[model samples]
Each structure stands twice: as structure tokens, then as C-alpha cells.
Target chain A: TPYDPLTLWTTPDPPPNCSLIQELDAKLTLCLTKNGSIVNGIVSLVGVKGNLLNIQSTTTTVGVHLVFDEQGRLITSTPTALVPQASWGYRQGQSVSTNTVTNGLGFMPNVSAYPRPNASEAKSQMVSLTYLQGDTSKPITMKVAFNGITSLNGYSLTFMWSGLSNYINQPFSTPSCSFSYITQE
Target chain B: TPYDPLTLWTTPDPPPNCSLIQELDAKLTLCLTKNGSIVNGIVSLVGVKGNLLNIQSTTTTVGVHLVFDEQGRLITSTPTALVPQASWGYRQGQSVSTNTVTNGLGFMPNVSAYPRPNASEAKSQMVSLTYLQGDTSKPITMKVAFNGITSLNGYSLTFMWSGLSNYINQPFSTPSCSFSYITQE
Candidate 1:
């Protein structure tokens, strides 16, 4: 029972054949001053259920795919898909912004952001890096992104941003970004 | 002290060098009857808080002593000098009788006036012989005399009677007779 994959995906037979393709992606380059970084990544769009992307690597990698909804909100990232169990999208102790584009449609920006002391000193426009208890070999990265604006409709969208792991086996630079979407389209 | 008698009796030193005579008289007798004949005996005018006067004995041994105001009652028989540390006088279901005499003076009839019925029909009197648990013999007769009348002057007396060892052991009758006494002189 512990190994049952159906517990993770319980959609009944004739499940919707839908795939979220990541077209415009970004490469997270890590200049680790220490040993090679063992990094784990996660990304998620705002206002989307079960939308997460994950990725993990023992060295610097690039071209990690991430999906976002219209209004520049990330739908999912490569890191969330790889290690779905280890990914933590919702952070605490940070400023958050939320907006409703339409009925049942909203976008939240930097919702799960956690900025450390003197975090701005690390790198402008980049997230902060911090070491967590487990998997100390690399830094964990969480990124945010936004989807392009689309016509106002009753559909919801979300963007996500993420940071990549550094060589010190820590989450480098707190990921900060926003979500933009239209409602009543 | 271990060397001291379990029960001790002492009197204040008699007026310096004046000889003081402190005496206590006790008597015991036995009564009996033929195998089929009815055996009866009477103990009248039993002196309480004083020396024993007359003691009649027969084949059947029946001891009667007066316990007057020993702990406050006119008991026809020696008041149980139950040690304070010993078993409490009243317990759950334990028979207890509180003599209510107007002037702390009462009378308890003799065995003949209050016959001890056979084991078959003994449980008829309002108060009869009942052998408590761990007690070897039944309480053939008991009396309690009080010191003096208190505020209860109108001669309201109550003889609380209860069957002894009813549920656990042989049930005995608990019968009581009440009478008021007035000074004749």
C-alpha cells in the first residue's frame, strides 16, 4: 500500500488526455564557489491545483522546463515533477500579493516567499540561498514566473518563480516573483 | 509502652497520704435447661457504674453486667470497651444502637423478661444476640447508660435498633423498648 502509485493519481478511467507543455523556459545557472552543487528544484503556478514541476541534479544544469498560465503565472516547473514528495511550494514569513482576475479566477504573486536577513545582498533579482536539514549536498531552488496576459475570461492562471541549488547543498536565494491573469474573459 | 497493660485503670493520688479504696466488683453466671425444657433466667436491678450485687449461676452460663454512662448510656450489660484504635463502633451494615434516655438513665430488662429464642426463632426481638465477624461468641446482652440529661428535657428518647451481621453472617433480631424515668425523691 505504501508503494501504490494510484494514491498519487486517482483519476477514474477515461481520464482527460491533457498535457502542459513548457514552451518558453529559462536556464538556472549556478556559480557555486564551493564543491559541485547537489540541487533540487520546485516551481508552481498560482491558483492551480496539482500543478508542480520538479528537477534535481548533482551538478549545475540548465534548460529546466516550467509551465505557466496566462498572466505570467507559472503552472509547474521541472523540479516539482521530479521529486513531488520533497517539493514544498507554499512558504511562510514573507510578503505576498494576490489578485482576482475573474470569478473563481485569481493570481498570487510571491505568495510563498521567505526573505532571509540581508537577502538582498546576495544577488539583485535572484533568490536567497539557505541550507535545510536534509539533502545537504546541494541548495534547493524555488522559482516564480508569470504567464502572458490573455483575454478576460472565467479561466484562472498562475505564474511561478524558483531558485536553483548551489554547491553548498542549500537552497540559494529565496525565490520571489508575481502572478498575473485575467478573469471573466 | 509495650510493658504497660493493654487496659489500665488508675485514680488520682488520693488526698495526700489519705487511704483511698478503689474497688470494682464483677459477676458472671450460667443458666441451662433440659434437652426439651425451656431454660430461662432474669437479671433485675443490675447495678451500672457500681459493684456487682447478686449473680446467679446455672448449668447454662449467662453473664450480665451493667455498663452505665461508660461512654454515655445505661447499658444493662458491660459496655463494649472497644479500644479507640480498634474497629469503629459503626460500619456499613453493622448494627448500632443509641439509647435515648431523658436523664441519661435507662433500664434494660433481664433475659427472662426478654427471652433469647432458639436459633430458628431468635430473629424476632427488636434487638437480639448477634455475633460480629471475628467475634467468637454472640452478644447475649448489652446496655449503655448515660451520665445526665442534656437540653433534651421533654423525654424524647430513641433506641436505634439494627439487625447485626444480617447479610454476612447469621441475622439476629433487633428489638428496642423505650421508657422515661423521673426522679422519685
Candidate 2:
């Protein structure tokens, strides 16, 4: 149990009991923190559910990154981003044909509404989000979903992303994502 | 801890063999005395093999719902909506653009069907579902789908939500659906 920083980032973030931290340079930040050592953002909310993850730009919220221990114990989580605005709509409303996962080899699998992001109703819905970040090859589709939603500030959707995808988190650059099932309050 | 009324709403319903209940207008519908209960609508099916979260809404079915302590942990279920009128019939026969979930998001992500209310036939295949309350925002995309179907009362389909976008529980208000695929019985 080494004190790997990512570990702190990978685990769930308890409230008012941890510390606040992040890697910042300009107004365009990436991650954040709270209490002592508490963490937030796309990567922090990966493994188990953490306090809600808030981001400045969810553009890189689709890809996933994974790392492992020397013994291959899987130390890291799959790279996962957020699709703050995913409009895949309801599976019923949308008439899809092939399996999104299997046939998604055409390009990087992004997201659509797995079901419909009906927050008021079904809170526990599987919402898979994916996409490319930079000049990286291979696809990164986060096999996660909407963990839950809370009215912390207003009405925010809490997306819990965990596990591994095929690619790693290529730092954000010319980021691009096609997601929007809801709007910002 | 003292019982908080909000606690009731906030907690995830427990699972792995437990008494099921649903939220009525103001009270909690407790475990049923028999296969019968004193409830209606989605949560209405809150006990032993629930009224099968039917749709006609989810009519004539069988499934389960799980949750945790004061935390609201949801679990297990499926076979929803009831598209007895969908025109998207038999993938092999209809020559659809592709698999619904395929035309959907890619990645390793896959999909199912909904609107199972049409349990008359197509009772066994994946499905998709959507919507519930008329006054909700956006749409409640159930990413939910049927794993398979069955020949139970009139006809039945097993719904598997709580885990993926592929699944929901809404009454068949306005009472109408259009489900299809594979073959219709």
C-alpha cells in the first residue's frame, strides 16, 4: 500500500474529512480537491464513487486511462472523461441497430443516452461515455454510467467512471467530444 | 442514528434478500403480504418478484429492485416499457440500418430493447425503454433493454436496468408503445 498519489485520486472521496489539491497553471484547470486530501474531477471519481466530480471543460471527459502495479495488480483505473451534455436520449426514443460496443470499432466510442438521462426518475442508469483526446490511437470508452445526481449547487448529474479502457489519458489539446443529453444550470 | 424522513428518500434500498417497498403519494408501501400489494405504478411492484415492473405499463412480468441502508443503493431488474407497436421489426428481416445499439454509441458498449409492454411475442431478445412522468425535464432515456423474453402471462420480458443505461419503470400512461425486432409472436 504505497502512498501513490493516484491512489488518493482513484479511491472514493469522503466529504469534510480530506484535503483539497489539484494541478493548476491557468484558469483552465483539470482536477480539484476538498477537506484534507479529498479529490474531485474526472480521474478522482473513477474507481468507486466519490463526492461529485466537477470539471471546467468536460471535453476530455470521454476517454479513459489505466495503469497497473509492477505485479500487474491493476493499480490504475481506465481513463474516463465526462459527457456533461449527452443527448443520446432514451434507448426507446432512439432506434439503434448494432451493439454500441461491438460495432463501435469504427472510431472512438463516445456516448449517447444509454437509456434516457431521466434524473428525476431512474437515478441508477448505466451511462457509458467515450471519445479521443489527442493524437492517440485506439479507442477509450469508459464502461461506467450515471452513479446518481444531487442538487449540491443546483441540479448536478454525478457520473461515476471506473475500470479500464483500451487507451490512456492523452493530455488535453485539440479536444473534441459530441455529448449533450442535458444542460448546465 | 435517528431516522430522518429524508433518510428514507436518500437511502439506497437494501438487497440480497430483503423486504421490498415503494414510495406512494406520501407513505412507503411495505413488503407485500402475498404476490399482491397496495400500490400502483413503478415502485408499486415492491416485493417478492415484484408485479414485474410492468408497463402497459410494464404489465405481467417478474423482476427485482435492491438498495442499501439510508444511502439508497439500487439494484437488479429489467424488461420495461412495452413497444407493442414499434415498426423496427426482425433485424434479419427488416434490413435495419444496423443494430439499434449499434446505430447507437460505439465502444465495447452494446444494447437491448425497451417498451416490453408488447409482451405478446418478441418476448425474448434485448429491448429498449424510455420516459415516465410528463412533467420531467429532457427525456428519461432508459438505456435499458431486455436480455430475453418469455411466455408468461399473455407474454413477458425480463428487464435488466439498475446496472446499465440499457434499462426503467414507468406506468403505461397515455398507454401506447411501438416495439419490434427479431420476430413477433
Candidate 3:
């Protein structure tokens, strides 16, 4: 009885009010921002509930950083040396906390209780996720979703990841891990 | 005994028809028609004063193959292939016989030619001459001349010679040697 070992289970999509955030590799992500901006800290990936996911990153540096535009497109990324101690080593020993807790729990804090940055300096981080599955060698199809809860900003950004080993000696048929995500806040 | 070489003869200026063709590795004389059609078998220097320099190769394979257009510009060159034979041996040799002898005998009759092809499909060739007091390491400059001759029927072709070494490793620079010849008959 080799039936398809799966049952049809569908969950309601999250409300359209939340914002989505995503993290790409360092150099590539920074390149998407405007000049004289800074990327202040490490990035985090929270849990996924249906089509929604949460992301968090520290913002210790100053100057203009990357964020989504009203249309959910990436506008620009911050540059190094623009903010105070905004270089790669600036966030070396800092401890970052990330948890998923519902509101009104006896010991759990609400979503709004998470640590946030300064009002004027904080950037609205958002992105869309497009999932795809195929021959394990190439991306076949994509499924897109948005995740933005605290605010309603629409900005989308495109980013790429590359490694020396992937380009230097690999054959044409060789495949590498690559994906794109769009978001807004 | 102290006669200056300058007094030996006036340094003749280059002729108006003379020009420097660049990006060619070998010396080649091309024959072309007034309409710039590349004649099949006949090869001659383009634009020389008279038809006095007409010559034919001893072997069919050693003859120049012309590719021209109606504008009288030498469009391309098709060199003779080197084949293993008794008369020519393993070299791609050109018959240096000339119709008119002027200013002493031009080149040696058939001593395998100083700048002969080393291999059958040699990509390049080099020619070196002894200098009494000049530095041999320095590059030498040479001019390319095109004997403008035109022909309506029969054969029209062009020949090329290497200004420097024709070795495959040392390719001709962009401004090396060039010629434009036409045929009228």
C-alpha cells in the first residue's frame, strides 16, 4: 500500500499587514545600498508560520542604510566607515537574542517587546520569498510570499551570492546554491 | 676613409604610395583586380610603378590565393599549404623568380629562402638580418607597399612577407604591415 504518504492540510494565510525581512551574504547585501551608509550588525532568521517568516538584525552604526521603498523594491545599502565603528568587526562580541513567543504568555514577552533600534535611524527591512524545487541542479519554479507585521512598507531588493570555488574550476554542468528574495516594510 | 654614411647617398623619403600595414606577421604581396576581385592563380605586388615584378611560384600549392572586392582594397590572403614533396621538401616555399631584374638581383634563386616556413601549417615566420653596429635586440620598423594593378579576367592575387619574426608565439601587432594592389587587364 504505497499510497502518497501525505494528507491534504491547508492553513489560512497570514494577514497582509505584516512585513517580511531577509538576509543575504555580506558584500552583496551592502552593495545594494546607497553610498555613505552602514550595515551595523549581524542578521537573524526567525521561525516560519505558513507563508510568513521573521527576520532581525542589529543596527549599531549610523548614516543611511538599506531599506525597502514604498513599492517594496530595494533602494540602497549603507557603506562602511560612514557610521561610528561601522566596519565588519564592529559587531564582533555582541550577543543577539531572537525568540518566537505569543502575546500574554506568563513568561513570554509580546512581539512588540523585542529590542528595536532608534526611531529615526531604524530601517524598514522587508523582502519576498520565492520557493522552488526541481532536479536539484536548477531552480524550477518559485512561490512568493511577504512577511511584514509591524509596518506596511513595500520595497523589493535583488541580491546574489558567489564563491571563488564555484566559479574558478567548476564544470558548466555543475550546480551551485542560489536563490532570490524580495521584500518590503 | 672618414666619409660619413650620410654623404654616401641622400636618405630617400618613403614614396607617396608607401604605407605601414599593421597587425600582420609576415610579408605578403597581393594581386587584386580594379574591382577588387581576387583572381584565382596570378599573384603580383599591388601598386608598384610597373608590371615589371610579375612572378609565378614553382609549385601550384606555393602560389598566392587572392580575396578582393570591387573597391580595389585587398580584403584577405589565402596562403599556400606546405606539403611533403621532393622539390620543396617539408617547407612551404615561394618561387622568387621575377620578370624584370632591377638594382641587382632581388632575392636568392631557391635556397629554401631565409624566412621560409618552418612547418607545413606554421602560423608565423621570422626574418633576421645582421646589423653591423645597430642593437639587435631593438625592434625594427618596416614598410608595406601595395602595387596597384587591375585585371578583368584570369588570375589576380597578393603576397605577404613578415616584417619581423613570423613565429606563432610572436604575433603581428595591430600596426604591422599592409598593402593594397589591383589588376587591370
Give interface RMSD, every candidate, in order: 49.6, 17.5, 35.9
lDDT (Cα, tens digit) per residue for candidate 1, span A1-185:
11211011101111112223232222121100000111111221111112213333343322233332343233333432222222112111111113221211122212113112222332212332321111222334332222212222211112222334333332221111111112111
* TM-scores, one per candidate: 0.17, 0.23, 0.14
Best by lDDT: 2
Residue-level lDDT tens digits of model 2 in A21-96: 2221111112212111111223322211121132223233322322222221222112212221111110221221
Write model 3 residue lDDT over A1-185, tens digit each, in one string: 12111110001111121122223211111211100001111121111332212111231111122333343322234321112212211111221112111110111101121112212111112111111211244221111111221123322221211111222212111112222111010
Which of the predicted structures, 2 or 3, would earn the higher TM-score when compared with the native? 2
DockQ for each candidate? Answer: 0.00, 0.03, 0.00
lDDT score at residue A4, model 3, on the 0-100 scale: 13
Give candidate 1 regions above 4 Å deviation.
A1-58, A62-105, A108-126, A132-137, A147-185, B1-185
TM-score of chain B of 1: 0.17
Cα lDDT for residue A159, candidate 2: 34
Model 3 chain A poorest ten-residue lDDT run? A3-12
lDDT of 3 by residue, B27-58 (tens): 22221111122111111122222211221222
Answer with 2 or 3, whichever has the higher DockQ. 2
Runs in model 2 with CA error above 4 Å? A1-125, A129-153, A158-185, B1-124, B127-153, B160-185
